Symmetry: D2
Subunit: 388 residues, 4 copies
């Protein structure tokens, strides 16, 4: 009763995840930097399908064109050697001091034009390496004080930057879509588009909305105390779950990026249940940081536990939905009735229906129990493997 | 140096606000019920412009048609006597036990049809009394456990109910628009459409999106730790701020509904600055509860402090934006540059501009300070009336 | 592979838990009131050991001496019939409007004297029924605004009330100890002694500290975002864990009181691991509310799941600590070294030890990994029953 | 109407505060390092009274004895030149990788002995420079996972380290006291002694409790959603407010360390009201970080706003307590009755008093309003300078 990942499970990892050296706001690095080639080989041995990158994880900031080509060649050799793919890439618009007030929404116009040129150069690289999704996390777009950022003008600037990127990709004929990753705060006091709902709403004002979706991350929505599986259900309902970032978080505090399955384990169960029952077919990407207490052995153990925990939860949620006694409890709780139209008969028929109002017996309907606690204990027994 | 409201300030109050008897999850009522006629007269004496109501605040649940007409007649007499208006109404789909699993998204189909008929009966009344906005707060739409609610089917049911309401109003030719009020939790474990962003995104999937906007409430977004003025800026940017609920909240905990100005006072300052500078012209509505420690004297003192605090903050934010030394600091922090297009020259010109990349001096741009702390201390001095 | 409680597991329930009628801040009761005699019989059938009560759960507020004796006689008959015990009692100083500003710390002195007399009358009853612990939850002690409560004077009044109660019990020669139950907010804006640490610190200023300990509740510490097992470890370290309240809570929001095992399931695992490894031998008491969606069938299913989840976690934490491969990982992570004195050699020897400073190789010590992630994945595999 | 600090106001700053180069978890430094001598001179020009330091802020980690003496000599010259004092010092047991699992509670015993020797070397320096308080913030004492730290053994190790430090100071005859600074999380997942209450309770188990108090920080208690003025009132009630750290924080999220007065401004008002009315006479120390958006001009503007905001709030809270109309409202709300003993007549007299129970009219007492909202609006008008 083992749970071994293969490339067919579509597990992916950022270079910056196993590569995090452990520098935190209060402490120096505890690990040496990893060569991207080494992380590719190590992850392929553990059963991953592919890796993702920011521009600056792969090519050191400020590299000449000659060093650039060399970093890319070595990387491409390691992907050829291992069969690893690169399904997603993104841009670092947060580390360099120039980005201290943002990239696409910095108050200085010159910085905003630089942020767009740095982005477009990386879209060409991403296409060259086969990525299908290009993520944008605007971690420096926001403010610590109320007068520093007029948010209407900042959303104008954010729409303008995403529209120009959509013009670029369509003009080049690339097959690449964008995914915005929300985060509510950190490193800015408040970050713009702080949740999946704010990012979905913003996309509907872009010139070509069909090019853009969301890349929600488990820990980010939980930094606002929100239910992550409910936000993913809304992104699926809108047709905008382009990619997802999996990790764990213990409640409302700094962004911990623990391995997937740590943090809120029942939310991890209900998230896997939803991804597998809606048939999400994108990458299962981990954006996590092995804690700085760990050496290299602890890094690969942490990355392997990400994939393990996903496959254990997958088996438990599939056993839950397959159990006849659960199917009976779902009917007892009227989940089948939730899926039927309230008024397929139409408005006039509803208005004329005396059984919907004038003769509706509210006390009898109120007295019906929902039987949700028995259903939730079945879900608990299935998660813990304690079926009796 | 007084700050007296008049009807022209457009301050409104729910009947349920000054009428809250003080029953909480742990305690009995501490005040007797108020007759709606008395609250109308008392609020008109304090300088309010109007009141709002749920159906069940005005006509006791289960009233016969004859009692209904009588409750309405007395109410209409008090509005005629005082000149008070009723700009907004809404439906109680949360108190009666029948709504224990929701109104529009209850699993039982019969309850969902009842919720729509109860709503439509109140839209006709609202129109009769002159309301222009009809609010929906779906406080029972959500779940305490993951299997009890499939959120995709529940958003289908929520879209179906709002589409049927938009069919009804258009068929009747009423001039009324809808405003959804988000809340992240309480009384359900998690509530659907938990923030302003989730409600904005959902509206874009309705059949006639132009009929629906948001009614955000200060304390609700702060129950998710979000910046309320930034969420209102996004609702204004989308053209969807139809109405607003003003109150105060001390951080992430139960929904306190304190009088406006209590809670986070700097967020109250930046919210008034934004409403008055964007020229919001809807009602300034208070959805608050005078604490149960208070008698009737303390109720009207609390309601008067709502309006007072709004007018004090209005004066301080207008003095802030009018101060030449603030206008100079805003330029020093490049707020004027945030309002200019990043690339009105277009994409090709940006790609060809060597000053945006190849010759952009990143170190010189990085070294420029943003001067945000001096700007924020000017904002502080203006709020506290300590201009030196 | 079943997990059936018996009276020997020491599971207890408040009358107010299965008896909660489901009134919330936004809704009417969804269930009829239960006779205490019926809850005693139903809980004894499910395998509980005993029940607890507030004065007002057992004898309706304002009952005459004659009705009092009658309510007590019927209750005592049901305990005799079932073998159920009553290990803990407490006082309702929160529901009646007189307590709207507190019991022991109300600003009105007359209310404070009434709160003490109401308490002492219930201590005599509790002793008569065999309780060994008397809990105090001061849910109305606190404030919504800063000027309403001088907290130094309020802690003087709180010390005075607890000192008088300790005088009473010692004068009567009763064998009863007190346990203060902290809660950070709700129903007051902020409650005094808001966490286990604040209650432990306060006890050390009472006249006879040995009579008082804490009754921490899982959901209350998590309403402040704190780690519940770490607060219980501190209460055990101080010798003050007199009683405990078990339930579940999803993060920082209103007090949900879900059944035990819901909420944060990994914290439930580590709490059971600690209670069983420290040999806590008090009652395992559930202070929970079956959700108002449920009928009576759902009430008893919820109460049975409390006990079930405890016994499943007990088995998983005992398998974890018994696994040789876990014992090896604990040594690999130096848990054995944490239990040894840092300097049993004494201060002078430490100062003279060159290996502690002058010749301590900091780089070699820094490079040692802690191997915490492999240990935590073993803990995960044990919780999920996925040992491979 | 200006508010200029002088050395007599006792404002102090850490070297690490104005010296923060702006490295965050996501970004490089935006400012060059400041020489301690320069910060001393700049702060003395702004009106500060003194500075504080960690060992490693003053003498670079690993410095030889010769470089040590030189760094100290230059520093002492700048204090002589400016008249600045050094009232508090502390140890860095968090930055170097050796401390990745803690200092006093690291699992490795060798690291724990090193942490104590590094501490004692800095106590001698602190005494030499005249500090009266030595702070300990154990930012690395805690865990990200439940098996990594047995908290009972870790509190044994923490008691042992503080007892050895108290032995050292008493053996040397130094006049220095210790202050523990709590923080609930960050950089560890959970930090031990996470709040002021947990630190107060822990001190009562040390061998010589009179040597130890707390150094609470505004933003840290608010990272747990707690009321900072109420925690300081409890520390004052216990006689343990040895020092305090002033700053601002916007709710439950990463530790922002904004300048004092930012964040929750009404809590800043009530904190100043309490410090000045209880006559706290220690340093008013700022532990803040000028945001990384700022250049050097913005650093000194931020530090000056710390002191400004304190003096504005001091004037407003003194005008509040001096206003006869406020004194009347405090009596109307029975604050005078809160300060009188509930039962100076003693227990037997209370038991015999029929007016406390048998003849107490609960309805009349319940009907009395507390008049808290009128009092809180007076407090609001005083804070905003809007007295009418
Ligand atoms: Mn993250
Ligand atoms: Mn991510
Ligand atoms: Mn509210
Ligand atoms: Mn509202
Ligand atoms: Mn509770
Ligand atoms: Mn409890
Ligand atoms: Mn801090
Ligand atoms: Mn500090």
């Amino acid at each position: 009763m083992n749970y071994q990942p293969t490339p067919e499970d579509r597990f992916t990892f950022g270079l910056w995840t196993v590569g995090w050296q452990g520098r935190d706001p209060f402490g120096d690095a505890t690990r040496r930097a990893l060569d991207p080639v080494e992380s590719v080989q190590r992850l392929a041995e553990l059963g991953a399908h592919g890796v993702t990158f920011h521009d600056d994880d792969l090519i050191p900031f400020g590299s000449s064109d000659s060093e650039r080509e060399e970093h890319v060649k070595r990387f491409r050799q390691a992907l050829d050697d291992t069969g690893m793919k690169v399904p997603m890439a993104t841009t670092n618009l947060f580390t360099h001091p120039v980005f201290k007030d943002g990239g696409f929404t910095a108050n200085d116009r010159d910085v905003r034009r630089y942020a767009l040129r740095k982005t477009i150069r990386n879209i060409d690289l991403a296409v060259e390496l086969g990525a299908e999704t290009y993520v944008a996390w605007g971690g420096r777009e926001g403010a610590e004080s109320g007068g520093a950022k007029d948010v209407r003008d900042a959303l104008d600037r954010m729409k303008e930057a995403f529209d120009l990127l959509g013009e670029y990709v369509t003009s080049q004929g690339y097959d690449i879509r964008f995914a915005i990753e929300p985060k509510p705060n950190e490193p800015r006091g408040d970050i713009l588009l702080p949740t999946v709902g704010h990012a979905l709403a913003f996309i509907e004002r872009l010139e070509r909305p069909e090019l853009y979706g969301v890349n929600p991350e488990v820990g980010h929505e939980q930094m606002a105390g929100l239910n992550f599986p409910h936000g993913i259900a809304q992104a699926l309902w809108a047709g905008k779950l382009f990619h997802i970032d999996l990790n764990g978080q213990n409640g409302i505090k700094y962004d911990q990026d623990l391995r997937f399955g740590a943090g809120d384990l029942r939310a991890a169960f209900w998230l896997v249940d939803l991804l597998e029952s809606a048939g999400y077919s994108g990458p299962r990407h981990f954006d996590f940081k092995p804690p700085r207490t760990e050496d290299f052995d602890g890094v690969w153990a942490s990355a392997a536990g990400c994939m393990r925990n996903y496959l254990i939860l997958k088996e438990r949620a599939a056993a839950f939905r397959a159990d006849p006694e659960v199917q009976e409890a779902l009917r007892a709780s009227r989940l089948d009735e939730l899926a039927r139209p309230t008024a397929a008969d139409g408005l006039q028929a509803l208005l004329d229906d005396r059984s919907a109002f004038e003769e509706f017996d509210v006390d009898a309907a109120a007295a019906r129990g929902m039987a949700f606690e028995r259903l939730d204990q079945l879900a608990m027994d299935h998660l813990l493997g304690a079926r009796g």
